[PDB]
């Protein structure tokens, strides 16, 4: 009768299936308490730990849940028995930056933020220290309210506060040196009788600071490049273009805007090639998600001019 829909903070809502395991995504949206303005920003994904797939409005979530091992087998080289899929509320990857940039809906801001925060904290955002220090300061206000000196002034910025305001990939070596500027800026949000108190203004300010990160809004895919030397990669694909991360470190390897690179289908459906326009070099990415990536690149580039 019912099914869990998660948000990227890990919370979830219970929904009623009008047509049982035949219930569509579109129905489910309407199944929850949501308008077609609100539904403009997100849809349903199905994700297990190592594969996330955006659903069409006419797909049937539960059957994809049922059919996951073969989906996994079609799309990845994972062991099927070690992944459990769940349904998620997450950003529509087609959502143009320009349209998002006008978002005023509290609910949408929240879904979008919980997702941005997850991405920030896991290391999928590369941005300079200044940017990271700003976001951390916003997280402090959001999670702990006004700066209050009695508790903080440094000594209450222990690696476990920190853990929750900076990317996990910066937290052992970079961020211990940012702790002063983080508190300074945190003091200014609380001290600012001009910048708004409210939970959705902070969340929105948070998204504002994310909008320029190159990988913002990307859907990730896993893959490999053969420089015997194999580099495991996340392929990021977004409204701005194509991005490769190291799977281990999250180090950004390359970022390419639509127009400054072209792609070719591999000889088989399990790889694709990227030719640099300026660097005049080529590389191949191996991943059984090749067809996905390539269609998302055609579709998102076409959303331009």
């Amino acid at each position: 009768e019912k099914v869990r829909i998660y948000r990227m903070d890990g919370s979830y809502r219970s929904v009623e299936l009008k047509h049982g395991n035949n219930t569509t995504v579109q129905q489910i949206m309407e199944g929850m308490r949501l308008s077609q303005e609100t539904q403009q920003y997100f849809t349903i994904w199905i994700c297990s730990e190592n594969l996330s797939l955006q659903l069409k409005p006419y797909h049937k979530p539960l059957q994809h849940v049922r059919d996951w091992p073969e989906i996994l087998a079609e799309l990845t080289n994972l062991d099927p028995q070690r992944e459990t899929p769940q349904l998620f509320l997450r950003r529509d990857v087609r959502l143009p930056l320009e349209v998002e940039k006008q978002i005023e809906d509290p609910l949408a801001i929240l879904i979008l933020f919980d997702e941005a925060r997850y991405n920030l904290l896991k290391g999928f955002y590369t941005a300079p220290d200044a940017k990271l220090i700003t976001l951390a300061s916003l997280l402090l206000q959001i999670v702990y309210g006004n700066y209050e000196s009695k508790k903080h002034k440094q000594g209450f910025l222990n690696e476990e506060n920190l853990k929750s305001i900076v990317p996990v990939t910066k937290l052992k070596s970079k961020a211990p040196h940012w702790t002063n500027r983080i508190l300074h800026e945190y003091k200014n949000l609380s001290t600012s009788e001009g910048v708004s108190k409210e939970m959705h203004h902070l969340q929105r300010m948070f998204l504002q600071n994310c909008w320029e990160i190159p990988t913002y809004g990307a859907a990730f895919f896993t893959g490999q490049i053969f420089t015997h030397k194999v580099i495991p990669v996340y392929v990021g694909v977004n409204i701005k273009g194509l991005h490769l991360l190291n799977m281990e470190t999250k180090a950004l390897l390359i970022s390419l805007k639509y127009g400054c690179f072209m792609w070719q289908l591999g000889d088989t459906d399990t790889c694709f090639q990227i030719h640099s326009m300026e660097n005049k070099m080529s590389f191949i990415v191996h991943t059984k998600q090749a067809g996905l990536v390539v269609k998302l690149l055609m579709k998102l580039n076409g959303q331009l001019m």
Binding site: L53, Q54, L55, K56, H59, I71, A219, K295
Partner: peptide, 7 residues
């Protein structure tokens, strides 16, 4: 055709 086109 339909059940395998994501995104």
């Amino acid at each position: 055709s339909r059940r395998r086109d994501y995104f």
